[PDB]
Structures are given as structure tokens and as C-alpha cells.
């Protein structure tokens, strides 16, 4: 559930964000409210695209849109095989470990009889 790979991140100058918070009836407020709904609905389809201003103030740009990813290496322990070992560990005590694939199971039943 928490593997947010490829999530959308948006960067906006704080002048617009701050103006909207203090002026609910200003043009900045309308555009901010539009972004909060448009970004939630941003799927992939027949008309998906992005258009951002290209202004620049420093070495970094004012507006940007990037898709995040894990900056490094992911998980290593492969929890899948951990569970399989423990399941065979449990069923072996009951003689029913063959489901993980005269027998052991038949001989085990004779003990109870």
C-alpha cells in the first residue's frame, strides 16, 4: 500500500500559495482550487498532458512537474520465501506438508486411530 512509486509532485512559487490563503476571492485562490481537483483526477487517457510556465529565477526553475522514484535500492529480504518456509514448518507437525507442492499423512492418521 505504501509503495508510492511514480507519484506526481508539483512545485509552485509560494507567492501564489500564500496569496490564496489570505485572499479567498482573488484570482490566485481560484487557480489553487482548480489544481487541487485537477491533480487528483490526473489519470492516463486520450487527452492527458501537462502545460506549465517556463519562468526561471535561479539555477532551479519556478515551476516543475516530476514523477518520484526510489532514490537508491529497494527492499532486499523477499518476504515471500520467508512465509513459505514458515508454512511448511507448521504443516510438518501435522503431517500435512504435502499440500505446499503409503505416505507420511496416512501413517500419521493411524496414530490417532
Amino acid at each position: 500500500t505504501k509503495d508510492m512509486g511514480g507519484v506526481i509532485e508539483l512545485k509552485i512559487p509560494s507567492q501564489i500559495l500564500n496569496k490564496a490563503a489570505m485572499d479567498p476571492s482573488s484570482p490566485e485562490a481560484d487557480m489553487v482550487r482548480g489544481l487541487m481537483s485537477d491533480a487528483a483526477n490526473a489519470h492516463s487517457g486520450e487527452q492527458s498532458f501537462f502545460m506549465l510556465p517556463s519562468d526561471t529565477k535561479d539555477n532551479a526553475p519556478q515551476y516543475s512537474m516530476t514523477l518520484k522514484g526510489i532514490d537508491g535500492m529497494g527492499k532486499q529480504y523477499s518476504t515471500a520465501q520467508l512465509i513459505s518456509d514458515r508454512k511448511k514448518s507448521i504443516l510438518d507437525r501435522l503431517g500435512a506438508g504435502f499440500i505446499n507442492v503409503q505416505t507420511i499423512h496416512t501413517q500419521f492418521v493411524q496414530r490417532v486411530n
Binding site: 514448518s89 507448521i90 510438518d92 507437525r93 507420511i104 501413517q107 500419521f108 493411524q110 496414530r111
Partner: protein
């Protein structure tokens, strides 16, 4: 001649063997270390399968008599005694005896 000239040295063979063991598996402790093992799901399973066939073997036991008429009468009495212990059966005895594993 007809005279022993030595001893089995039971009292020495033990006392060397208790030193040459890690101290968690010497006599007065091994009783605890056995029951603190077993709760491993691979150790229990190995012992359980061993007892499964030991009980099976000593369930349908038989007494084999000799050739003379005296032996046949003795074999019948032996079978009666071994199958009429008050509150005990050979399967229970076999699964108690096999605890030396």
C-alpha cells in the same frame, strides 16, 4: 585362567565424557535443554515421526514358541501376561521406552 584382570571403568568413562561437553548439555542440565529444544518445529517433527513407527511396530506383536509341547504352553501364558497389565499396554510402554532418543 578363570579370573578377571581389569575393570570396565564405568566411573571414569563418564567423568571424561562430562568434561568434553559444552556445559549446557551435561547431566543435570540436559533435562532442561531437551525441553527447551523440542519447541523448534523441525526438532519436534523429527521425534514425532520416529515415535509414529515405534508405536506401530509394538502394536501387533507376536510370541514365537519353540518345538516342544512345554514351550507352547509357556508362550500362551506369556501372551496373556503381556496383554493384561492393569492400566498399561505395550504401545504405551514402547513410547515411554523410546525416550532414550
Amino acid at each position: 585362567r578363570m579370573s578377571e584382570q581389569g575393570t570396565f571403568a564405568l566411573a571414569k568413562v563418564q567423568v571424561d565424557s562430562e568434561r568434553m561437553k559444552a556445559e549446557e548439555i551435561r547431566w543435570p542440565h540436559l533435562i532442561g535443554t531437551a525441553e527447551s529444544m523440542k519447541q523448534d518445529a523441525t526438532v519436534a517433527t523429527g521425534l514425532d515421526m520416529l515415535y509414529t513407527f515405534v508405536e506401530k511396530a509394538f502394536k501387533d506383536f507376536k510370541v514365537i514358541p519353540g518345538e516342544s509341547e512345554e514351550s507352547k504352553k509357556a508362550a500362551k501364558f506369556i501372551e496373556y501376561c503381556l496383554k493384561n497389565m492393569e492400566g498399561q499396554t505395550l504401545r504405551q510402554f514402547a513410547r515411554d521406552a523410546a525416550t532414550f532418543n
